[PDB]
Design a binder for these strands. Sequence first.
DNA 1: GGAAACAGCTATGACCATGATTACGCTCAGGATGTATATATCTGACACGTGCCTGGAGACTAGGGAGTAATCCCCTTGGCGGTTA
Length: 166
Amino acid sequence: LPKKELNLYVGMSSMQKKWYKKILEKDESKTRLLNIMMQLRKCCNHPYLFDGAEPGPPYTTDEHLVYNAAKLQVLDKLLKKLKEEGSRVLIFSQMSRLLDILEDYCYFRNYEYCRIDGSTAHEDRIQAIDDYNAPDSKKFVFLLTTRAGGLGINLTSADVVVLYDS
DNA sequence: GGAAACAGCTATGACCATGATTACGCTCAGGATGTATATATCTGACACGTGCCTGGAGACTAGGGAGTAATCCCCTTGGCGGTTA
């Protein structure tokens, strides 16, 4: 059985277009751009990563996060579809900090999962893998990094794997 | 009927409360003192004219400092992963 591949070209969120211009035109201000590569990469990845895109002193946790994000709207659609389809999904990303927001947004949707990140533990890696690969595991999603997570482990219990970033 | 025993009354001392007195401080008094003020008058120093002259300001040439292009490559940068003190 082969594998399918689709590249979900989604438009960059209009809400963060303010800050994306604020990065291109150097408009928010008075910070580093020593690696314009990464700065645009983080804005390409997620807006709240720039330390002030989340204005709330209580830091509200609601649909605004998926609202202000370009990708998570398609993610929310695909998570709803794959939940009914029973697809056991794996998510890969580069920024461990971004995964915190996904961990927070996983809490919002109340999914079971296990978060493996660079330098979590030794026994925690084993146990989180076991719970995810446990038979009939309801851990519908699985947070994982890119350069720390997928270098030899087998996840045949899963079928669909999604990249947040390239 | 007498003696003991207890109870109540009385007085006195003790202790606390109030009144006065005093002393000390201070804040007014008042004196002492030293300071500001004004004024009228010297006077020396600062400002200004005069003369002069030599640096300043052009005027002119020439030759390499500075300026730019192109090139490159090494290095700083940043995020992570995983340790541990």
